[PDB]
Symmetry: C2
Subunit: 144 residues, 2 copies
């Protein structure tokens, strides 16, 4: 390899960024198939992880405005995907059964699997094994 | 492993690396004095000089009010320049100043991500590094085909 560690790092970071950008498109399609925007889906997922979370904390955790978060919350309540834990930014929420079912469905992204499946048909078994092992090595080395 | 299990493993690993990269992106933003949203705006304006505030909001998928506040902030900091002197207008068009270009560049070339990857590379062989890059590049190329 002629290139420096620095040029190699750039190439790797550009490559990962490009994969992540393509992956975001498939993440959009998966959201769309559930009838939601990616932002609506992110909100449902936060509420799934943190039942009883307040709107104030939900907003901050999504890094969005209160007016847009309050509109989005209102929209998810309209769809029967979330429920108010007190029906009297201080509002607390949890998912309805319908909200949980969609959140779970979102975990399996059928669009990304079909796409990666096509990629694998054009990789050798040794490349697949190595691709997995080397990225996992990078991940683990990054974690420390 | 079955192919389905290998796809899952890869996708989880990529997701995890992206999660780690995001944390370094936050450190970098902090070092540039800007929020991630401020840098996202800077980066859009860099690739599309003369973009309108109306279209800037739609591309960032943000409120009109926030976009207008954020835009006036970037003008206060000397990072963007109006192409016709009303700061809160949706019809306002923008380009980055020189200093805006400089920080955009430092945002894309994340020095904290690089140092982190240099330490990773120290625990990888010259052959592993070439294959990591080659195989990931192959994956990207094949994704772009279908």
């Amino acid at each position: 390899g002629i290139n420096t560690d620095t040029e190699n790092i750039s190439e790797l970071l550009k490559t990962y960024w490009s994969i992540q950008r393509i992956s975001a498109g498939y993440a959009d399609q998966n959201a769309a198939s559930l009838g939601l925007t990616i932002q609506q889906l992110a909100m449902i997922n936060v509420i799934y992880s943190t039942p009883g979370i307040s709107v104030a904390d939900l907003t901050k955790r999504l890094i969005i405005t209160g007016s847009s978060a309050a509109a989005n919350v209102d929209g998810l309540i309209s769809l029967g995907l979330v429920v108010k834990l007190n029906k009297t930014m201080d509002l607390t929420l949890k998912l309805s059964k319908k909200g949980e079912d969609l959140s779970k469905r979102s975990t399996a992204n059928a669009f990304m699997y079909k796409a990666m499946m096509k990629v694998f048909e054009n990789l050798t078994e040794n490349e697949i094994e190595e691709l997995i092992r080397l990225n996992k090595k990078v991940e683990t080395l990054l974690k420390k």
